[model samples]
Target chain A: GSARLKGITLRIGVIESVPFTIVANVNTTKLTGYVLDLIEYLRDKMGFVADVQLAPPNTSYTGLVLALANGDYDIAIGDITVTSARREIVAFSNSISDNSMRILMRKGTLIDGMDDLKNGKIPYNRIGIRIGTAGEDYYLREISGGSRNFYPLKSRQEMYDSLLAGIIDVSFMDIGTAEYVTNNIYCNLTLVGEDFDKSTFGIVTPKEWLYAKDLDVNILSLRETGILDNLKKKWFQTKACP
Target chain B: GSARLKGITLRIGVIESVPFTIVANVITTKLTGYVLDLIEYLRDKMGFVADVQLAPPNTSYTGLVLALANGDYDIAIGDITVTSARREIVAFSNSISDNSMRILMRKGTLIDGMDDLKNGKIPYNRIGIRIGTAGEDYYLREISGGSRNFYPLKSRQEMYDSLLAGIIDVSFMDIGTAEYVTNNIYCNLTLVGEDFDKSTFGIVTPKEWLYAKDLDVNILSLRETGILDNLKKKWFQTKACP
Candidate 1:
C-alpha cells in the first residue's frame, strides 16, 4: 500500500468525442487529441505508463464516467464537460478547455432561447438531443414544459445529422462540436442565440485514486508552461472533414 | 483505506467575492453563498470539519490562489473563476455554479453592449473593476485600454455603488450579483447588453492535494441531489444589504 502509484500502467478509458478524444483510424489503433496528449504528458511527467482505449460501449460521455467509477479504468477523458451531474460520481482534473451548450439551427430561425422558448414565438418542431449529455439535462431542467417534441439521438454526430437531414429541426450541443459542424461540416447549420450552461473539459477519475494529486500537479504544470493552451489551440484548430 | 476521510478539519481561504463568499456582519464571522454552502455539505457528507478564513492577501484571484499553492491552507473558495492562468498554480475542483461577467450600467443608456465597446462608440468615462478577478482580466483583454478609463474598487459592492453614485460611467460584475443588485438591491443600476466570458465557480487547492478528487465528487453529489441548487437559492435569496 505504501508503494508509489506512478510508474504503473494506468488504464485510461476514452471516447469518440471530437477535438478532445478520438480513436485513430490510421495504420495504428490508438487514441489522440487534446485529451490523449494531456494524458500522455502526464505519463511522461509522472513516471507512469498509460493505456488509452475506447471505453466499454455505452452512449455519450456518461458511459465513460460510469466505467471509471466502476473501476474498469483508472481514468476517463473526452469532450466530457464536468457537469454537476457527472461530478457526483467522478473526480475531475481542472478543465482542459472551455465549452458551452449552443443552439445549432438554420440561419433565419430567430434565435434567443429566452424570448423564443418563453414567448412561444418560434415553436420547436422536433428538436434533436443527445442522450446522456448536458443537452439532455438542460432540456429537462430549464427548456420549458419538458419533453415535448424531441428526438433522442445516440451520439453527437447523429444529433447534428438529424437536423441537417430535416429529421429534426434544431439541436443543442457543446460549442466545440457545434462550431466544427456549423463552420466546416454543415454549411447550412450555424450557431444561434446565446451560449448557455458553459462548462470545461476535465479528466475524470475514481474518488479514491491515491495518485490523483499528481494528476492535478501535472495539469497545473502544463498550464504554467503554456502546454495546455498550446495543445488546445493545436487540436481545437483542426477541422474533422474539411 | 475504507475509513471516511472524515472529521479532519479543512482550512478554506476566502475573500469578499459577493454571492460567493460574504462575511456576515453578525456577532461571529460567517461565510455563506453557493461556494460556502457546497463546502459545508462536503463537511457533512465526507465526514470532515472546515475552517473558512480570508486569504493572507494579494490581488486578482491570485491571492487565494497563492495561499493554496503555498500550503497556507488546504483549500480556497470564493467567486474564483477557473482560468488558464490560475490553473497554472492551483487545482480547481468541479464548478460549484455557472457565471459570467456582464456590463452593469444605469438602466437607461446608449450603451448597447459588446458591439458598442467593439465599435468604440459608447464614449466611456470610466469602467469599474475588482483588484483580483476575471472582470479585470476581461476588461484589459477585451473591453478597453485600461487604467486611463477605469476605476478599480476593493469589492463588488463598491463597483456597484461607484456606478450608482456617478463615480464611474459603467462597470461589470458576475451576472449573479449584477442581476441581484440591479433587480433587487440597487434600483438604478441594471445589467446592460449580454453576458460574456461566462465561467463557473470551483473549489481550489494545492496543485497536488490528495483530497481534491473527493472534493469534486462530493460537490457533484450535492448538485445531483438538488442540495447545491437549494443552498444556492437559500443563500442567494439573502439581500446584499439590509
Candidate 2:
C-alpha cells in the first residue's frame, strides 16, 4: 500500500517555446511560460496536479500522441495546431488560439498581391516556410501549378535569413511571426496578400485520458471569461506568438 | 583518293598549347601553341611537311588514341602528359616541356607551408584547378585528407572568381599558370613552397602510326637545335600560356 501511494508524479510532455515554455538555461530543471501559467491556473483554480517534462521538438508531436494514447502522460501542453488529419489520430482540447497563414515578404520587390502571384507575374519565386506548419500546407493547397515555390526550412531563423538574403522572394508564416518579423528584426519585410481563413491552435491529449472531459470544460471556461484574449494580448502584443 | 584525303582530314585532330592544348577564341578553332611553333621551326628550317587539324581538348586524346590504335588518325597534337599508365594505351612524342606543380594562394593568407594545413586550418577553403591536369593530381596526392575541398572548376576564369571572392583561399597550378596568376590577374596571390617534380608534357600519337617514329625524330632534332628554346621563351614570357 505504501509503494502504490509513494508520491506518484504525473509527467506531461511539452515542446519548449519562448513565452510558452521557458526553462532554466543551464540546468533545464525550472520551467516557466504561458503554458506553465495555464497549467498553474488549471492546478490552483481547478485543483489538478501533474508533473511537466519538456520534450524535444521531434518527439513532442508523434511521440506524445503515442505515449498519451498508451496512457503515459497526464496531458501534453504545447501549442499543437489542430487540423482535420490530426483529429483522426488523437483527441484535442478546446481551441487555445486562432492562427492564420500569411505571406511574409521583403517590403518591396515587385510581388504585391496574391492575384499578382496567381497571374504568373512572379514566376519561379522561392517561398520559405517551416515544414509541417499550416502555412506550408495552405500554400501547397491554394497556390496553383507552381505559383508558390516552397523552400521548407527547419527553423524560423533560417526562413528569416533566406528571405533577407533574397534566396526566397517570400515566406508563409504565422500572423504573429509575420508581425514580429515586420515590426522588429526586418522592418523592410511585410506580410503580402490575404491570410488563410481556417487555422486554430489547440492543446493535445490522448483519447483515453480520464481528465480529458474536465480539461475541455476548463479550456472553454477560460475562453468564456476572456482569459484567453487577455493572455493573447499580453503575450503576442509585446512578444512573438507563445 | 580525294575521299580518302577527306577521311584523313576528319581523322586529324590538333590541340595547341605550350604544354597543354588550348583553343583559339576568334574562330573557336584549334591552333598549336609553343609546341606547334617548335614543329613549324622543324618544317621551315629542315624542309619537312606535316598536316595539322584542330579538335576539342580530350577529343584528340581519347579519340586519336583509339583511332590511331585502330588505324584512324595519322598523328595528333596535344600537351599530353607522359605517364606510364597512358604509355600502355598510346605512344608519345619526345618531351616538349617540363612543368612543375605549384600552390596558388590569395595575396595575404597564413598558409605559408603544406604543414600548416595538416590540422585543417583551411576548413571549407576551396582549392581551384583544372580537372585531370598534373597540378590537380599532385595537389590531390600531397594534400592528405581534405581532398574533396578542392574545387575542380571547368575553366581558369571560374578559378579566378572563387579565389577573388575568398571562397577558395588557394589553387594548384602549373609553373606557367602560377607565374601568370601571380604577375597579372591575382597580383596579391603568390606561389608558395617549392615546385613539384616528376611531371613532363609531350605530344601523343597512336602506338602503331607510321608517322610516330618520324615525329619522334623530328621532335628530337628540334630539341637539339635552339628551336624548342626559342618557343619556350616566346610563350612563357607572355601572361597567356597557350
Candidate 3:
C-alpha cells in the first residue's frame, strides 16, 4: 500500500549530463537520454504526468538536490550521485544508475596508482574537480585532506578543456561520462587505474516525499525486468574511437 | 527535514547469515557481525534502543520482509536483497551493502560462461538454488524460463551440502557469502566468470515507515565516514583456509 499519486503532475528537474539527460532544441524542446527515458517510462507505468524542466547549464548537483528539497521540483534527475551529504537534505529513490569515480589523464601519461594523487606525487592544484560534485567531495576528503586546493570548474566543458589543454594534469569524473567523452570525443584522454569510490545515482526528492515508495518500486521493476540494462546499453554502448 | 527518531526502542528482526549476521552463543547471548554492528552504530547515532531478535532457523527472507510489513518488526536485516518483487510489499533504505550474483561450483569445475546454465548446458534440476533468494529469482527469470526445473533448497546449508555431495551440479549464490564460504569454509568451492545481476542489499522497512528517512540518513552518515567500508573489511577479510 504505497502512496497513491495517480493523475498527479510531477515537477521533474533535470540537469544536462550527456547520455543521462541531454537537452536538444534549446529554444524549448527535446530531452532524451537515459534519465528522460526513465522518467517517461515511470510516467507511463504510474499514470503520473511529468513536467520535465532542465536546470540551467552547470547546475551543481547539490543545488539540484536543494531545489528538490525546497520544493522547486518534485524530483531532480541527472548524474546526481546519491551521497550521504545529499541524503541529509533530500531523499533519493533506490539506485537509478550504477556509478563510480575514475581519474582521467592523457593516454600516455605515466602513473602508478591512486597513491599518486593521494600522497602528493601529483600537485594538488593541477588536479581538476567539478565543484559541488562527488569528485570534489572525494578530492577534499581523500586527496586534499580538506584543503580544497585542486582546480575547480563549474561545467564539464571547462573540465574537459582544462584536461585537454594541460591546464589540469588530471581530473576526477564519473565513469559513465568519462568513458563516453574519452572514447567518442577526447580520444587522447584515458582512465587510469581501477575505478574507485563506487556509488550510485538516484532521483532526488524531498525528505520523506509521499511518492517515494511508488517511484522506487517502479524503478526497481525496470531494473528487474532488464529495462534499465537495455536503457544503459542504448545510451552508453556507442563508441566513436576507431 | 527528516523525522526525528530519538530515544525510541526499535524492534529489529535478524536472520543468521555468516559474515553478516552470525549467531553466537544462541542460548541468550551476543550478536556480533556486520548487521549487528550496523544496528549498534545506528542505535548509538539515533539514540534508539534496539531490541534485536533472531529469526528462527531457515527463515526465508521473504518471510522476514513480510514480518516487517505485518508490524512484527520495525526492520529486517541480513543479506536481504533489494529486488522489485520484494519492493512491492516492503520498503528499503538506500543500499546497505553492494551485492551481485555469482556461480558457485567446486574448484576445477569448468564453466565457459553464464550461457552454460542459461542454455540448458547444465541440467536444470542439478542446479541448486536456495528458496526466497535473488539467486532463485535469477534462475527462474534467466535460466528456467518460467519452468521451476531447478533443485530447490531451504537454506545455505542444504545448498552447500548438495553441492559438496554432487547432488547439485552448480548453484547461484551471493558473491559475499560465496567468497566467504569458498575461501574459508568450503575450500573446494570457487566462483567462475564475472559477477552478474549486480544488485545491493538494504534494510527492509514497512512501506512509508515513519522513520525511513531518518534511518537512511544515519546509515548514509556511516557510509560517508568510511565506517561501512571499515565494517565490511573487518567482517569479510578474514580467511581460515591456508
Of the candidates shown, which would achieve the greatest DockQ relative to the real structure? 3
- Give the best candidate by lDDT: 3
Per-residue lDDT tens digits for candidate 2, residues A13-74, read: 77655556666765447787678778766666456456787875555345555666677665
User: Considering every candidate listed, which one attains the maximal TM-score?
Assistant: 3
Clashes of 3: 0
TM-score of chain B of 2: 0.73
Off by over 4 Å in 2: A1-10, A22-24, A57-74, A123-125, A144-149, A184-188, A239-242, B1-242
Please state the error at residue B69 of candidate 2 in Å.
Answer: 96
DockQ of each candidate's interface versus the true one? 0.16, 0.00, 0.53
lDDT of 1 by residue, A5-35 (tens): 4778888878876667766667757666778
Q: TM-score of the B chain in model 3?
A: 0.95
lDDT of 3 by residue, A1-242 (tens): 24766899989999988888887786577889988888888888999988988887767888788777778998887788888788778878899777888899887877666888877787898898889888888888888679979998888889888888988888888999889988888898889988878788888887767787788888888887888989999999989997
- Order of candidates by TM-score, top first? 3, 1, 2
Q: What is the lDDT of residue A202 in candidate 1?
A: 81
List the pairs of residues colliding in candidate 1: B6-B47, B7-B47, B60-B132, B61-B132
Note the Cα lDDT for every prediction shown: 0.70, 0.59, 0.84
